[PDB]
RNA sequence: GCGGAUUUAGCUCAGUUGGGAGAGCGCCAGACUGAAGAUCUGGAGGUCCUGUGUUCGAUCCACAGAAUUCGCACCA
RNA sequence: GAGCCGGUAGCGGGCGUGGAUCCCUGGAUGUCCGAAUGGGGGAACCCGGCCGGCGGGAACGCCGGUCACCGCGCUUUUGCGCGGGGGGAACCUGGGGAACUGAAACAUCUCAGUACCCAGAGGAGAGGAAAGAGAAAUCGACUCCCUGAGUAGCGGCGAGCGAAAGGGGACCAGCCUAAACCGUCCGGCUUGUCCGGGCGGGGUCGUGGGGCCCUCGGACACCGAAUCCCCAGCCUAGCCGAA
RNA sequence: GUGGUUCGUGGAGCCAUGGGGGAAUCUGGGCGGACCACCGCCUAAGGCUAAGUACUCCGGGUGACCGAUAGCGCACCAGU
RNA sequence: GCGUAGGGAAACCGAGUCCGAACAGGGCGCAAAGUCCGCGGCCGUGGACCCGAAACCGGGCGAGCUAGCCCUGGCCAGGGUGAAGCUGGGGUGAGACCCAGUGGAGGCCCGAACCGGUGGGGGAUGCAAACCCCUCGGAUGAGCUGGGGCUAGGAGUGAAAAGCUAACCGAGCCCGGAGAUAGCUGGUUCUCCCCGAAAUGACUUUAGGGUCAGCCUCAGG
RNA sequence: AGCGUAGGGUUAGGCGGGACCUAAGGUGAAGCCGAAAGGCGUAGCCGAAGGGCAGCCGGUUAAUAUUCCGGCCCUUCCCGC
RNA sequence: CCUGGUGUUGGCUCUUGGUCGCGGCGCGGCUGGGGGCCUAACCCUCGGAUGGGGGGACAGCGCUUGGCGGGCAGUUUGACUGGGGCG
RNA sequence: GGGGGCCUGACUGCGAGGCCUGCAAGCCGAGCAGGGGCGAAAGCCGGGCCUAGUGAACCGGUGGUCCCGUGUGGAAGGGCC
């Protein structure tokens, strides 16, 4: 029985999970209930259609946090806000992150990323292992400062 | 006509008929029955062009069915 | 005659560790009885179907027959 | 080419060479039944909507025409426009399909796939370019006649049943489409690359088809029809016609 | 498990199918009579195809074919 | 296609061959050679010397026959017998229960039409393919009935003998297999010449058939 | 002559059948099952001296008659007001 | 008509048997028996609609197995024989 | 016909030539060859002193052949003993 799957097997892994559910069988109460369907060409083209779409859209989000990644990794992180000898009066946040060197310095980046102990405050040069991509991120330069 | 399948036909002829083996395996065969029967499959609910529910049986059932060559579900 | 089932005491049968030949009877005897029976004691019971072979040793393992029995095979 | 109102010869009356009777072919009527079909029904009868004159409607209102059964396609819209079915002596294939009787019984067998019934095609259907035949590396459509052959062979090896290739002959004759490969799109899913159906590519005769790259190459090859008059044959009477 | 075939169960194939499994797209896939090697043939599982043979209701032709109890039974107000 | 060799299960050999390992026999060699046709006595397939039955099998045909069953009407002149009941009276508590009145059932009795058809009479080329005469049973009922229909002929129906199913159903009737087979039965034609039969023996699901012999006849040596 | 030839005879708004109704039963669009022919079968329809429906008495020919005469008794549809 | 396997006859769990491999037990593939509501076929059900309800893997029903089986169908059941038979 | 000695011909290949005979059967048999046994040897032996102890042909089993083998190599299968 080429059963195409959509769901269960065991719960619901619509992920590539052919299985002989056998004649019938797996024929009726399986699909007449409406959870994948069978062979049929033109799916097992579907599936793959499918799984090459994905294949298009890791790569790609490959290339897309690969980009801002060197152009990112290279240049600076300058935040002059006010303080007195150390610290900010209003610490300073990843927050106040993304708004800036987006606007600012350009390209759009999140503000849920960067890996942010809490609030920092010491102003001027303390780099941040900034979270990009899932598996590469940026561990970029932060130089801030009291402007005074 | 409505006793047969719609994807095909496979009704009718049927002449068996039993005897008293006993041959290769030693001596010679015989024989005796002289009858005539039916033999096919069966039928399930399906439709096309605008209601019809259909019918023809397992076999070719199990085709169309899961297709459809002149009518789905 | 094609196949299966077996072969031990007078009868009916156990017997698997390859080394004791066993049980029941039933049978015989003793005790008991007026005797016999019933009970208790005891005893015997032998071609382990035959032959040959294997083995230190064969009821037991191996090799034909046979016989009994059941089913089947039947167009000379 | 000159007689006629049929077989009726009879009474009573009449058409006709300013081409009658009749011979032809194409017509217009074709009452009622019968597949019947508008509806009903014991056939040849009795019943209904639309139009219809308007008609005696003497100072009072009708037949005629018509029309429409149901299964088939599908311009689907509210479905408008095409085909069918009933026959038919014999013959045709399919669907189904038997005892007698022979075997000097009779259960195998035979009569047979006959007789019959059913459906349906035709004027002929049957069948028909081969996963064929056989083995000389030989043959090639199908069919039918002779022959092969009462042979090879089937079998209570009994009664019987009993092929075919090859050779001779009649005839000839070849073609298509799914056949997702290409492009066209139309409709969906839901945008891609899925299935879908109309257009061509190809749409295979004896292994090919596409898609790519260079040689191409640049008019006689008609089928089962399609067509024109042609001799259109016949279609009944055509008419002379030696002494 | 039946068919047809000369094949009546047979050493018994090809083609056709009643039920059940359910392959391949050209070194693929049946075939040449159990099967197997090698050789040889063919390319299926859709379709159309006049002509060559059959048959007489019809019309004609012809008869070592008939004559009214023969011929079709029925030669003429007969399938009555 | 028969003859041109054949011999053999075959391989195959071949005027020789198969058995075999032996020159012992079987088949044949030895040409004598047919072949086609015509005309005949016959033999097989044929309906096949000719008609003859009871039956089997196919497709139709019928409940205006009759047996039923469904639907729907009609019909039983008179009379007789007298149960449930209800009314009243009756010794006990009420009653059982008795009696008397009324009352009117019952596949009930006596009998017409109507349904039938034992028991005798006639009739026997009848009046008639079941009828006439005298006689008899049933006589509000598994009652008789008209009209409308349903079933069906290997199947129906059947208060059931194998009855009835269009006047003889032990499995209807018509057309079809078909001119079924038919050791039995008959039937089996113009003259004349020639000779002249058997009625036994052997084997038969064979004995009143028929195979082979024995006895006939014609052609040649 | 209930035999031959010839001629002639039977008339209905109200009598009977239909122009109304259904049970059996038969048909039968849909629906259901057959190898084919076919089987069944809803509703609707067919189906009768069962239901329903508006008259009777006398006269009058060679024959008819509740129809023809006449005297007496009615019903349904339609148009008008 | 009864009957094994097979089919459109789908899920979930409870289990014992065989087997060969690594009297035994541990495991292992194998495969056999079986007990359960369910349940989406199937069927039936209906009860006022197409939803519910009940049964449910049944069974109907198809294919092969086997069995009963005079209910029916078709044949048969010799010869001799100083009559047929019995003998 | 009664014992004892070794011995098995209680043979294969065949049989000239007859008995009985419608059929098929049935039955006999010198002698020829290969190969033995018994006897010195001349010879006898192809079961019995005989005449009953029986069966067609097909339907098959099996030990031998290496005859056929359905395109050739073979085998299923078949023919012959």
């Known amino acids: ?148 | 006509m409505q006793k047969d399948l719609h994807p095909k036909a496979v009704p009718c002829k049927i002449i068996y008929q039993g005897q008293v083996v006993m041959e290769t395996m030693s001596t010679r065969p015989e024989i005796h029955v002289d009858v005539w029967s039916g033999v096919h499959p069966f039928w399930t609910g399906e439709e096309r062009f605008l209601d019809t529910e259909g019918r023809v049986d397992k076999f070719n059932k199990r085709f169309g069915d899961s297709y459809r060559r002149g009518s789905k579900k």
């Open chain 1, 1 to 148: 029985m080429k059963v195409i799957f959509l769901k269960d097997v065991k719960g619901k892994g619509k992920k590539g999970e052919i299985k002989n559910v056998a004649d019938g069988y797996a024929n009726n109460f399986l699909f007449k209930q409406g959870l994948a369907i069978e062979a049929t060409p033109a799916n097992l083209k579907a599936l793959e259609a499918q799984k090459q779409k994905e294949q298009r859209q890791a790569a790609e989000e490959l290339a897309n946090a690969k980009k801002l990644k060197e152009q990112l990794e290279k240049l600076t992180v300058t935040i002059p806000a006010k303080a007195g000898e150390g610290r900010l009066f209003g610490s300073i946040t990843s927050k106040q992150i993304a708004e800036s060197l987006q606007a600012q310095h350009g390209l759009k980046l999140d503000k849920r990323k960067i890996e942010l102990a809490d609030a920092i405050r010491a102003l001027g040069y303390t780099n941040v292992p900034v979270k990009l991509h899932p598996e590469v991120t940026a561990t970029l330069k932060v130089h801030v400062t009291e402007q005074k």
